[PDB]
Amino acid sequence: QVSTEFIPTRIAILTVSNRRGEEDDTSGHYLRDSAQEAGHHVVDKAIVKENRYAIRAQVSAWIASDDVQVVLITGGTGLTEGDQAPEALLPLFDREVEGFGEVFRMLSFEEIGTSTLQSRAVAGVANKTLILAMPGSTKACRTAWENIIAPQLDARTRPCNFHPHLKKGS
Amino acid sequence: SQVSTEFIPTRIAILTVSNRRGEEDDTSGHYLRDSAQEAGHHVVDKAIVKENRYAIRAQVSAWIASDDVQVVLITGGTGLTEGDQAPEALLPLFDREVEGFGEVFRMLSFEEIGTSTLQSRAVAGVANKTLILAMPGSTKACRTAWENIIAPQLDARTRPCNFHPHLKKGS
């Protein structure tokens, strides 16, 4: 249930962008730096285009892996044709974690108001791999990381958190 | 529409879904590989995975997204128990279902093996212009599917129409 100690988790980070490469992947860099600073282990990282098959390929590999416990995705949750992260990912879930999108939208409403409507953040679990998909904006990633994700990936957080139920290595 | 005068090879990946069988035991996958090669197609990849939806999704997703794989042939895991996961793995990955494959296969199978046909759930779909055909683990079932359904539809010469015009173009 609740650990006396912090327990590093193994995290993979996906950026979904048509144009950004590693050089200007500001949100992916933020997430990687923030995860490492908190003491987690970023075991893999990729950037893919706004393509549902590319996303499914990379996320399916991490879902099936022995080592990846958490997947963070940034980008592709918007409302236009090319935004495909929810379309890609929802079919891969065993269960949806409805609380992630809801709390994210609640906290975002406070920070950016009605613009919260323009994103479709979503989370789920597949093969005991937690999948968290958030907007491409670094500001959004910060809100999600600081206020939702980091707390829930800390095995000490009360009354409960993800740790006990993440995929065991092996 | 669209019929070719010449045979045009397709690029095929073959998946066997089995807990126990390794390559030496893999009669159906060998059958599909050999039949595809004999017909002139190129088998560009082959894998064996356990009866695990995630392993199936990882491999089939890689092939869907690939530049080269136009057709995925899967054998195994279409039965009616808890451990058979091929349809459950695959259906969520499809853009569209190819309803005629399962239906024609079941017609042919009922004639061949009778009511035992009910014990399998053959299914096909397309994803990213990649044709995915999932058939039972038995070699007899693979022969019936290949000879009477799949080979003709993968032959660009087949009238009145076939898959060729619409499979994923190479880069």
Side-chain angles (χ1 to χ4, degrees), chain A residues 1-19 21-97 99-167 169-170, chain B residues 3-19 22-81 83-110 112-171:
Chain A
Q1 21 92 88
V2 179
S3 184
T4 63
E5 11 197 316
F6 182 79
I7 299 176
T9 65
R10 298 177 289 275
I11 298 173
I13 296 172
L14 189 63
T15 298
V16 179
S17 174
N18 286 147
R19 287 177 317 207
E22 285 287 357
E23 79 115 29
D24 58 1
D25 180 15
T26 295
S27 298
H29 292 183
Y30 165 74
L31 290 172
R32 175 210 55 214
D33 296 345
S34 293
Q36 287 170 162
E37 281 175 352
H40 299 295
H41 296 138
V42 178
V43 299
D44 207 357
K45 181 171 186 315
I47 305 169
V48 295
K49 294 208 190 287
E50 302 180 343
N51 179 290
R52 74 168 66 171
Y53 314 104
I55 295 164
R56 291 173 178 166
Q58 180 64 265
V59 179
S60 289
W62 292 334
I63 287 163
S65 69
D66 287 341
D67 61 321
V68 176
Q69 292 179 307
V70 179
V71 181
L72 307 180
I73 309 151
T74 166
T77 69
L79 289 188
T80 66
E81 124 189 79
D83 291 302
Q84 292 290 316
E87 285 77 2
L89 300 167
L90 277 162
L92 309 180
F93 294 166
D94 302 331
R95 276 158 329 271
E96 193 163 344
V97 182
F100 170 76
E102 288 177 14
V103 169
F104 174 79
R105 233 117 33 225
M106 180 175 351
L107 293 172
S108 287
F109 183 70
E110 295 298 327
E111 265 177 277
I112 67 171
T114 61
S115 300
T116 196
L117 270 64
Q118 297 302 143
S119 299
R120 300 180 291 143
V122 65
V125 181
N127 197 35
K128 303 195 184 193
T129 310
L130 177 62
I131 302 147
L132 300 153
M134 75 204 78
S137 106
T138 307
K139 178 181 213 144
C141 294
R142 181 172 293 116
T143 291
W145 179 261
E146 294 184 344
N147 300 119
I148 315 175
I149 301 167
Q152 281 298 294
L153 296 191
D154 192 325
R156 306 166 295 179
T157 289
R158 280 172 177 80
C160 53
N161 59 80
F162 281 104
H163 198 284
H165 295 164
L166 300 169
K167 176 195 293 166
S170 51
Chain B
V3 157
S4 181
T5 64
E6 316 160 18
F7 180 81
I8 307 178
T10 67
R11 297 178 288 277
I12 300 182
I14 292 169
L15 188 67
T16 300
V17 175
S18 171
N19 288 329
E23 275 290 345
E24 162 166 43
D25 307 321
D26 183 21
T27 316
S28 288
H30 289 175
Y31 167 81
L32 289 171
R33 177 206 62 202
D34 291 349
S35 301
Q37 284 179 342
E38 283 158 16
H41 297 293
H42 300 306
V43 173
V44 297
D45 205 1
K46 191 183 182 296
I48 301 175
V49 298
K50 305 217 172 343
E51 308 180 323
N52 179 290
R53 74 180 47 191
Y54 311 106
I56 293 162
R57 293 175 176 164
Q59 182 59 267
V60 172
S61 296
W63 292 333
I64 286 165
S66 69
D67 287 341
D68 68 315
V69 178
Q70 297 177 302
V71 182
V72 182
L73 304 179
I74 310 166
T75 166
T78 73
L80 299 183
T81 77
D84 285 301
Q85 289 291 316
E88 286 80 356
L90 293 167
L91 269 11
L93 305 181
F94 293 164
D95 298 332
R96 258 169 226 181
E97 188 169 349
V98 175
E99 250 179 336
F101 179 69
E103 290 178 15
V104 172
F105 176 75
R106 219 108 50 208
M107 186 162 47
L108 297 172
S109 191
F110 181 59
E112 185 175 36
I113 66 172
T115 64
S116 295
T117 199
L118 268 62
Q119 291 301 324
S120 297
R121 308 174 292 146
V123 65
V126 179
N128 193 38
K129 305 190 185 180
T130 311
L131 174 62
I132 319 299
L133 301 154
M135 73 207 79
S138 100
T139 309
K140 178 179 237 168
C142 294
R143 184 174 301 114
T144 291
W146 179 259
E147 293 181 350
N148 297 282
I149 315 173
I150 301 168
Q153 282 294 298
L154 299 186
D155 195 322
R157 298 168 291 187
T158 295
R159 295 171 70 86
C161 60
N162 61 76
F163 279 103
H164 182 47
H166 308 148
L167 296 172
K168 178 196 296 168
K169 296 183 194 192
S171 310

